[PDB]
């Protein structure tokens, strides 16, 4: 069996990698943050309740100016809100009514969407004529789209259900580099602050850090018991947090290349749907299937508060660029802004 | 400048509200259906009679709008994209008549899924012609795969369709109770299953899904008033 001998030597390197990771873990983060004073109880009330969507909200993305946001639901409707005054700006009908993602360009000119059509539809908001229409339909993915994020007006990174991620070119419509290596559906991704790198969490209970330019996976992070539903980079850009179905939120380190902390409770048994950090990274906000959002101290693993205002499970959570507010959209077609 | 900017914003919001309300009437009028098979189970015939990962099909029956969505080219793993189909009226399950055992496992995993607890499953026992000729020819057998069939007896309430072999009548109903065994074992009443012995050539499958959809709505309305 010439195939078997390859596995025997391959697992030795995996064993060697395991030994290296444990050697670098001289001391855990719990002892290094034992003397830090706790943040204490925090009160956060829903300042605004954005309503108007018909079907369940599946994703949302804050604007780069901390004012507008785009929310996509399962009725084929894209709504752009104004969080300050709660007035809709646009209502874009969708070709396919089974989208699971949306995005806001850093220039505020484009909005993308994708879902159970393997096609990432991109709309332009600053058209010369006046009405919002699809500018370019990016096709080439095999599985359903799960999360698409913008780099600039000419580049976009999309993660599909065919265990691959892509880096598209807007004008040409052809993907430049295709990222391979995942064994299961890719559910979420988050760009680094410098945009050089990005990680993606798939259904293999593993997160893989990719390189945007050369299209090669540098490091692989594992340790989760079940699949990963959402992921988010640390504000510093040298860490990220993953939300999984097995009801654990984990914090990883790029430089350490291993686990740092786990956020879990015996009471909590449902999976995590969305994870995001705060402005300073001290506060971690995680969504759950029990209709509640739990606020986790990212340095002490102790819950600081609970954001419970939704009648159904949350499927999207996002914190503004300046950290002034957090918007959590749930399956009850309601978006709430907490402050 | 606060007064000038707000004036245009209100008109846009009011105009969008009018357009959104109009589309809300249409969305609530149509009934969404999910056509799902066991893989090469003959479901292609149902969609035809009436690039892209989901095919959209709309047909008009008795002044009622239906919307059947068949998922094509998506990966075999349905554990992630099946949570979207938790607001559809029903799932039009098509089961080929091994292939039979794998059909039951997917149906059991759909019935017990937390999201698709409420959603009802319309079940079609298509490809019955091959099943009818399988027992008659004797080349292929099912009691070897399903040992309960030898001891199994024809149900009393079964209606004999004239011109059919009484032996194959037992085989057809045996699959129905095998699918109904899981449906009734873990059934809290929030959802139901409607087995149907359909064919690959009859055009009456449209009528069957029309009556079954009305049955679901009648039960849903009754339990909304706590009558049932």
């Amino acid at each position, epitope marked *: 069996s010439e195939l078997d001998q390859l596995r025997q030597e391959a697992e030795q390197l995996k064993n060697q990698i395991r030994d290296a990771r444990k050697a670098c873990a001289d001391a855990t983060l719990s002892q290094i943050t034992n003397n830090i004073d706790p943040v204490g109880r925090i009160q956060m009330r829903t300042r605004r309740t954005l309503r108007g969507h018909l079907a369940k909200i599946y994703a949302m993305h804050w604007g780069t100016d901390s004012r507008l946001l785009v929310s996509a639901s399962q009725d084929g409707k894209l709504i752009i809100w104004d969080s300050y005054t709660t007035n809709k700006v646009h209502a874009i009908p969708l070709r396919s009514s089974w989208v699971m993602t949306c995005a806001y360009a850093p220039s505020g000119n484009y909005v993308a969407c994708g879902g159970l059509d393997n096609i990432c539809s991109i709309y332009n908001l600053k058209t010369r004529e006046g009405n919002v229409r699809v500018s370019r339909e990016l096709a080439g993915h095999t599985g359903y789209l799960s999360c698409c994020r913008f780099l600039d007006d000419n580049q976009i990174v999309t993660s599909s259900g065919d265990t691959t991620c892509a880096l598209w070119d807007i004008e040409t419509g052809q993907q430049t580099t295709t990222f391979t290596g995942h*064994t*299961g559906d890719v559910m979420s991704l988050s760009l680094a602050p410098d945009t050089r790198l990005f990680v993606s969490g798939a259904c293999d*209970a593993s997160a893989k850090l990719w390189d945007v330019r050369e299209g090669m996976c540098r490091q692989t992070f*594992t340790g989760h018991e*079940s699949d990963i539903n959402a992921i988010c980079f640390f504000p510093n850009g040298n860490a990220f947090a993953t939300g999984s179905d097995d009801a654990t939120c984990r914090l990883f380190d790029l430089r350490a290349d291993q686990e740092l902390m786990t956020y879990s409770h015996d009471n909590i048994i449902c999976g995590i749907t969305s994870v995001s950090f705060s402005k300073s990274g001290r506060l971690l906000l995680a969504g759950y299937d029990d209709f509640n959002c739990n606020v986790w101290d990212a340095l002490k693993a102790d819950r600081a508060g609970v954001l419970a205002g939704h009648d159904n499970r949350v499927s999207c959570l996002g914190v503004t660029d300046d950290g002034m507010a957090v918007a959590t959209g749930s399956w009850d077609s309601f978006l709430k802004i907490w402050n | 400048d606060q007064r000038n900017e707000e004036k245009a914003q209100r008109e846009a919001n009011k105009k969008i509200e009018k357009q959104l309300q109009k589309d809300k009437q249409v969305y609530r009028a149509t009934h969404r259906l999910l056509l799902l098979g066991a893989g090469e189970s003959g479901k292609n015939t149902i969609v035809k009679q009436m690039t892209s990962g989901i095919f959209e099909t709309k047909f008009q029956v008795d002044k009622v709008n239906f919307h059947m969505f068949d998922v094509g080219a998506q990966r075999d*793993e349905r554990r992630k994209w099946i949570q979207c189909f938790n607001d559809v009226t029903a799932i039009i399950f098509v089961v080929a008549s091994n292939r039979l055992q794998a059909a039951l496992k997917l149906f*059991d995993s759909i019935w017990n899924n937390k999201w698709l607890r409420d959603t009802s499953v319309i079940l079609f026992l298509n490809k019955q012609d091959l099943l009818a000729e399988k027992v008659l020819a004797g080349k292929s057998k099912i009691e070897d795969y399903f040992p309960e069939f030898a001891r199994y007896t024809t149900p009393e309430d079964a209606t004999p369709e004239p011109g059919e072999d009484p032996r194959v009548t037992r085989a057809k109903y045996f699959i129905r109770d095998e699918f109904l065994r899981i449906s009734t074992a873990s059934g809290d009443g929030r959802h139901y299953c409607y087995p149907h012995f359909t064919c690959s050539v009859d055009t009456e499958n449209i009528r069957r899904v029309f009556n079954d959809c009305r049955d679901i709505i009648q039960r849903m309305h009754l339990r909304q008033y706590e009558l049932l």
Partner: nanobody, 128 residues
Framework: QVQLQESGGGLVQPGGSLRLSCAASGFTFSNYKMNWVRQAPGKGLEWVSDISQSGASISYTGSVKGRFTISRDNAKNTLYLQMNSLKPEDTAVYYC?????????????????????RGQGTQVTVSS
């Protein structure tokens, strides 16, 4: 990183009793449903049996109810499959599968062609 390497298997005479022990690591075993899946030569994946988290609810495929018995031990996180009265028809490679989510009754994609939480099967041969 979950990985399931199971022992047992190999060439055996017809009717020769064998046991298939599945070793689990990387995840807690007390709250995950377990399954057994075989791959017949020239055919697709087939489902054999499953056991609930508590070990009470046990279900088998049609052809192995009178031949196979299964057990699960949570103290040593090992899953066992017992083979009795084998025939040349059922020869295949047996994979020890795991249920994608905990604290749930449904189980999806166990028999899927590409599954992340599935071990490397051991080929068993029953012939004379």
């Amino acid at each position: 990183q979950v990985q399931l390497q199971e022992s047992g298997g190999g060439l055996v005479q017809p009717g020769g009793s064998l046991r298939l022990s599945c070793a689990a690591s990387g995840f807690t075993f007390s709250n995950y449903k377990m399954n057994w899946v075989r791959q017949a030569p020239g055919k697709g994946l087939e489902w054999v049996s499953d056991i609930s988290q508590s070990g009470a609810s046990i279900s088998y495929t049609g052809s192995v109810k009178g031949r196979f018995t299964i057990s699960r031990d949570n103290a040593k996180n090992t899953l066992y499959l017992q083979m009795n009265s084998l025939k040349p028809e059922d020869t295949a490679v047996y994979y020890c599968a795991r249920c994608p989510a905990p604290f749930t009754r449904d189980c999806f994609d166990v028999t899927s062609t590409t599954y992340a939480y599935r071990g490397q099967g051991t080929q068993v041969t029953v012939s004379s």
